[PDB]
Design a protein around this ligand. Sequence first.
Ligand SMILES: Nc1ncnc2c1ncn2[C@@H]1O[C@H](COP(=O)(O)OP(=O)(O)OP(=O)(O)O)[C@@H](O)[C@H]1O
Ligand SMILES: [Mg+2]
Lengths: 113, 1077, 171, 240
Amino acid sequence: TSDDYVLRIFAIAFTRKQANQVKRHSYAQSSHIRAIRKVISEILTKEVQGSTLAQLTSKLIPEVINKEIENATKDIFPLQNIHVRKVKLLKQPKFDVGALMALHGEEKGKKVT
Amino acid sequence: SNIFKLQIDELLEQVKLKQKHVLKVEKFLHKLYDILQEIPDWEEKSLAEVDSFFKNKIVSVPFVDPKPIPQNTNYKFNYKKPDISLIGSFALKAGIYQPNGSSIDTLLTMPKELFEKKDFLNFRCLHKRSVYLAYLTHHLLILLKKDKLDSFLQLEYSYFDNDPLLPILRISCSKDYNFYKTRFSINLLIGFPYKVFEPKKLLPNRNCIRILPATPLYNFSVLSSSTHENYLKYLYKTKKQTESFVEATVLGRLWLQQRGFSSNMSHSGSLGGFGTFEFTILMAALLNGGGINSNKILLHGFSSYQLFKGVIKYLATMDLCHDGHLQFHSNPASKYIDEGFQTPTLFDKSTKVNILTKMTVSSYQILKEYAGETLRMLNNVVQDQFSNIFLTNISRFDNLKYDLCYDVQLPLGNNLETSLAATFGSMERVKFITLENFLAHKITNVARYALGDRIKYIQIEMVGQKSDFPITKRKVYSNTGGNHFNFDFVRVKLIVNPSECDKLVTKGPAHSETMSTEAAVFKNFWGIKSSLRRFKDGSITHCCVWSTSSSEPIISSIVNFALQKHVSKKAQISNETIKKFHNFLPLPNLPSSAKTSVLNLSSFFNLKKSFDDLYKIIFQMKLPLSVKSILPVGSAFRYTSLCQPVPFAYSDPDFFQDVILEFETSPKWPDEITSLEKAKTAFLLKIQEELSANSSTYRSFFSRDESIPYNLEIVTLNILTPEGYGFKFRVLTERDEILYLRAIANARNELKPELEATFLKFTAKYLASVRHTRTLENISHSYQFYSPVVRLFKRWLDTHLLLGHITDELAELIAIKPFVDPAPYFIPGSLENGFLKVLKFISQWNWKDDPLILDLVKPESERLTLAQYKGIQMNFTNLRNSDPNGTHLQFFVASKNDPSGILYSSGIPLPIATRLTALAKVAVNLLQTHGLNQQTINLLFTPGLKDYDFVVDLRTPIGLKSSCGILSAPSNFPENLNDLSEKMDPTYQLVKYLNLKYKNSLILSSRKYIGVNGGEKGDKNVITGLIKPLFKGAHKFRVNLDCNVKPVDDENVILNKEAIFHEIAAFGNDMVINFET
Amino acid sequence: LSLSAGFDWTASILAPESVADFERLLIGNPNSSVVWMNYMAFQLQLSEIEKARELAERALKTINFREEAEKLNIWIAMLNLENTFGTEETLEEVFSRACQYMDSYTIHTKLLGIYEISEKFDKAAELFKATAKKFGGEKVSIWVSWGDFLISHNEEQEARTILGNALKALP
Amino acid sequence: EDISAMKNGFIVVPFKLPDHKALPASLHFMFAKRHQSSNSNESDCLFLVNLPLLSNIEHMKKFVGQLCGKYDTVSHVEELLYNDEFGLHEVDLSALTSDLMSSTPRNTALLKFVDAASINNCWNALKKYSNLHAKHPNELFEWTYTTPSFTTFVNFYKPLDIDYLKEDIHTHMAIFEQREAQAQEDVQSSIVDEDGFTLVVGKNTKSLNSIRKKILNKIDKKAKKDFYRFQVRERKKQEI
Ligand SMILES: Nc1ncnc2c1ncn2[C@@H]1O[C@H](COP(=O)(O)OP(=O)(O)OP(=O)(O)O)[C@@H](O)[C@H]1O
Ligand SMILES: [Mg+2]
């Protein structure tokens, strides 16, 4: 990320049949899969690089990423059930308490006597 | 590396002393050496007899305090011929040209027979030394008269390394034997012979002053005086063994001087004790080992850079004071011991001396950070660091070198108060030879304990201390001192820790059934201020509580209390410089504003929370396209808005925080630019319409925007949050970018530069802006003081009518330079320190020949690499090639977010750029001439206003200072949103609209923030002008003149200054009041 | 009191005979082609053709885009520069670049006079043939200027032929 | 003051200026000349230099009328062309980015009249109105500096009329879809040149203009080094 958070994402998608399709199956040639896979990898790379971890998680909740993928891959091959399957956190920067407080939006004791 | 080697050689030759001046001096001292041998011997004398002998002479024996009394001076005195010798740098031929001047050390070995084996007790030897110095001075004086050299040589006493126990005679030449042009001064050291006193009895732990407590300083004074030639012989051997010694020695001397270090004593309070000699010895210790396994850390084959780096690396990492020390042998391999003596130590087991006694712990600690600081710089590969390491002075201003400075005026300062003086006592006299040495330690301990973790580095300096006195006086005389105390006042300088500096409790030891030693001292130290408290964690610990103020830091309160309780109850602690700067920062009209510390950003957090509530609403609203992302890009989101956001204060310019709205990619957008704009509005209509129905509590209205030239259809939605905040909405479309590029392509060649400027503003506002606010928001968390200093900096620009042209973005990128690139200084830790550094940089920054490129990264990935760096460097050279004078572009500010560098600095007229440089130069010059005091700083923040050709005085109907949330106040938004204008200040738009009309002829400037810089009521603002040189003079009449003129002849016209006065007067309507020309 | 600094308008705070003098003049006179031409001619006198070209590009950009008359001077100077000190290819590049920015027919006229002044008659005859073919159907001046050239070089019959071609092409 | 005309023909047309408290007989001068251009829209115009601030057609209407009364001439001003005070309307960004919906000096504008009888009448007055400053400066006219447009310009921070904005969007989009619909048919309609060449229009292309722009914007690997007897023979030659 832009925060020096090294993370790994898993994106999963499925092929679908068009409205008027008659063939039982909807298999995609490997040329489409590698083309689609290249586009999905680009989009994930673009978003995470151009975002913070706090911003990134704000993307996950509304699943705007899944909608971006669908539009990008719409020309190559129609798809369905596109999701970000998983997000792994490999490495973390030096802990910055100042940031942690800001993400969450000091206090005095009571004289004990 | 090769560039570094050539740079080093270029430095060495530049500082290389001119050999002719060497010969001029050797010609003298050799002749002087004949004079010394002329000096006649003397017989045994008692203190009464010598007192009579010197009773009427002009010379006065400079006895060391306490002066010998008749009872204890039963031992006699005598003078014999010495063994003259030359020591110091000049012996090793490692001196360099110093504009201030250098010193030639000549050691005079008193013959051994003038001593008893037990002369190292109770100042016995120091007395014998003092008279022997006195006898030489008198006889040298008359012999100097005999040879008629007395005409141009001035004789005075002084202290060696500011050691009060070691007065010396100094020879200097005022304007054939005249060596004034050489800029050298001869110093006559009266040292003892080697091994006169058992060095075991002179070890630091032992004592030599009967009163038992140890006497490290007095032990060091005698023992070192007996070991001078030995260290010359030791250093002399190494210079033979390694060919790279001398140029290694000069470099360190250069480095040390820039950081305000020296071999002068530090216990008195001045920073020093690490000089060339110690830097020279420390190599010779390393050249014979250095590691824990006694293995060699520096090889004789090492070059200059390699020897230097090893020592810097050695100091930076291995510790010599708290845990571990280095012992070596002059006459056996050097080895690093784990055990530490809790003081900066470097034994010489051969001689049983500690070379670092003169080093203070506070000074030693700072020396490491500089050592650690450069070692990072030295390992840097991306940027050249030679100019910063060696050719930059940080010690010119203490304030730039220290975050906070306090001056404590002690009481009764012709002799110090009896109460405080009684604290000196006999015991501490034995431990600490002088009161100044003692009192500096008293201040630092209590200052160190009280501030605790709030500070990193502390220095206590005895301001106005002298070290040289005329031959007719026995000790130094200060006008305040009256021979009692060689100082005027004490200044406390601190390197603060921004993380915990503003901590509102000073935590302490945790409670226990039986009061522990650590607990006891805490309760004694703070006394009544000490309290035993519990927290909501459930912990019970002793802690004392303070109060923040928006005027001064918690540290000011602590030190003020801390000193008065223990040092002296009459002390007066003051820092008016820091206080005034804090005041200049606008004070928000929020609850409990006065008690808020400037490091508090809570006002911004409330705005972000206010955004978040609206952020949820937009997403769940249904639209033809899903909302891809809503990105805040407003000033207040990055902690850089000038005045903290205040609810409902809608007169402030930065009230409406922009937000970027991006929809999902679609192919159905209009292909034409205007249709794209009107498509974007149509959503803001739907967003506005739906928002009104579902959440009627919010309010909305529309406003046009004209920042982007020629894109006149852009419309924005303003949302007024019930919490009391405003937001502006603008839509970003993927097709939007490529439509501009299409515009540049199809434009005629003459017009391509103009359209490029339009695209440049766009990428600045939509595309680059998102990256900026992200990077600046995150990085601010590690640099706490960034938000204040940049705001106060923006304030300073506004008072002088610069924020009108300097785009706000350029203000941040310049202001962040001291933080990301603190070298050679430290990271700013206080408001005075940060702001000046921004001014120091601009003053010395040569924007025609040097680009500014910043690594917007947190303190030590995302650093610039070699390839990226060489890429940006090439951009500047390509740019300057077409624009050598820098007319079209002045400031090159680039980073990853903008490798181009022209995005945030295009369009600034050259006159404005020079002013920001000219004013910066004037400001720093003023500080050098007049120190930082209340008067100087007021000048910094008042505008000259006289250079502008004509000045128009402008006034608003109503005072806005309350409506800007500025506490010297509205509580709801007006019902009819048209009324918003009636509490606004349109001058900023007046100037912007004027400049376009008179771009070729006039450059007008106005105060954007009227509430802050508009007087008490925040309603006084000024429009200042300038006439370009071409139109200042008459010009032949032509159609393309394109400026408002008046005729003089058939084909001659002149600028119609009087007409322009009306057109300015027309815009303001009632607002314009008075004109000056 | 106040901090006050004189307004510095040549960046100093940071007849012409030197680079500094010409650059200093251009500070206040960016739209004067004469100053640019004088600076260019100074470099050419110094045999600094490569630098003289570099100044030409700056003059083309630095001068305000509305000052067509000033721009026309710069391009004409470049045409003389390449004609005198340049090769055939570079002159064609500037010539083709010149027609791109300004009135195409006018630049044909200026290069044509330049050839006549330099007495490159053989090239001058050819450029009429290109000029007349492109603009002959609309401009009577090119045909008249051709007839002057042929008559000036004692070719009366060729002038009669050109006049016949002129009548054929012109409305 | 004695001057009445610039030798290049620009007649000076002095005026008096208003009175305001901030500045306690200051004059603003305009230089005018007859404009000649074959272009019909630019015909019957008066070229003007150094216009007063924010001078719209209404200001001229006051001035031409104030001229009409004193010299009993009938002159009607039609419109003010090329009046761009701030340089906001130099480049029409709509024209550059596409052809649909837009088929397309400084401190000066062109002042068009209704007919030639008006402009020559006004010009003859302008010659007279020039002579006044030499003789009787006191009767010089006064530029109001204030008109309905001036008030609208001044009020910078004014919310737009949501009712107005919606109708501007509505007509603007309705026209664009028609133009977009009209073009897209033309590209994909089997274009045929007179000599029976069928233009090749891809699917998804929308406008003939974009086709034109694409056109304007825009063996060695298969050769064998040793295939013919001369090549190897040449290789034999270099080998020895
Ligand atoms: N800390 C010390 N411990 C022991 N002896 C010292 C110390 N500092 C200086 N001396 C002795 O004093 C002599 C001269 O001291 P000084 O510091 O002036 O030397 P230097 O390196 O020649 O100085 P400079 O920086 O003026 O060139 C040294 O040669 C050494 O004999
Ligand atoms: Mg020395």
